From Swiss-Prot:
This is DNA ligase 4. Coiled coil: none annotated. It comes from Homo sapiens (Human). Belongs to the ATP-dependent DNA ligase family. Mg(2+) 1 binds at E52. DNA ligase involved in DNA non-homologous end joining (NHEJ); required for double-strand break (DSB) repair and V(D)J recombination. Catalyzes the NHEJ ligation step of the broken DNA during DSB repair by resealing the DNA breaks after the gap filling is completed. Joins single-strand breaks in a double-stranded polydeoxynucleotide in an ATP-dependent reaction. LIG4 is mechanistically flexible: it can ligate nicks as well as compatible DNA overhangs alone, while in the presence of XRCC4, it can ligate ends with 2-nucleotides (nt) microhomology and 1-nt gaps. It comes from the Eukaryota. Testis, thymus, prostate and heart. Interacts with XRCC4; the LIG4-XRCC4 subcomplex has a 1:2 stoichiometry and XRCC4 is required for LIG4 stability. Component of the core long-range non-homologous end joining (NHEJ) complex (also named DNA-PK complex) composed of PRKDC, LIG4, XRCC4, XRCC6/Ku70, XRCC5/Ku86 and NHEJ1/XLF. Additional component of the NHEJ complex includes PAXX. Following autophosphorylation, PRKDC dissociates from DNA, leading to formation of the short-range NHEJ complex, composed of LIG4, XRCC4, XRCC6/Ku70, XRCC5/Ku86 and NHEJ1/XLF. Interacts with DCLRE1C; the interaction is direct. Interacts with APLF. It is linked to LIG4 syndrome: Characterized by immunodeficiency and developmental and growth delay. Patients display unusual facial features, microcephaly, growth and/or developmental delay, pancytopenia, and various skin abnormalities. Severe combined immunodeficiency autosomal recessive T-cell-negative/B-cell-negative/NK-cell-positive with sensitivity to ionizing radiation: A form of severe combined immunodeficiency, a genetically and clinically heterogeneous group of rare congenital disorders characterized by impairment of both humoral and cell-mediated immunity, leukopenia, and low or absent antibody levels. Patients present in infancy with recurrent, persistent infections by opportunistic organisms. ATP binds at E52, K66. It is found in: Nucleus.
DNA sequence: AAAACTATGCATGCTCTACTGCTTCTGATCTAGTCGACC
């Protein structure tokens, strides 16, 4: 689950553990935020979202199911 | 011609400085195992 306020991002797991270190707390750093920051529309500054985090292979353009690996 | 003084060489001990071999300490590497958290 992702919390967004302006340029500030925060991520939480199923049981409540912080994961912002991995996914980035600002567009300058991270593994997802620098690329998803510009996806949001002009009028949206505060947001809470819930979803799944997955691994994507661009070569085959396919989701790699995280059975137990990668 | 005989006796006293001195020079030089050599033996002797002790002290000091390189080289080889044994023992111990450190670093580097690999292998095995543990823990967080997800599902």
């Amino acid at each position: 689950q992702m919390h967004k306020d302006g340029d500030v991002y925060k991520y939480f797991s199923r049981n409540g553990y912080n994961y912002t270190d991995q996914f980035g707390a600002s567009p300058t750093e991270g593994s997802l935020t620098p690329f998803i920051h510009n996806a949001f529309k002009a009028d949206i500054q505060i947001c809470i979202l819930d979803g799944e985090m997955m691994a994507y292979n661009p070569n085959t353009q396919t989701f790699m199911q995280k059975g137990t690996k990668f």
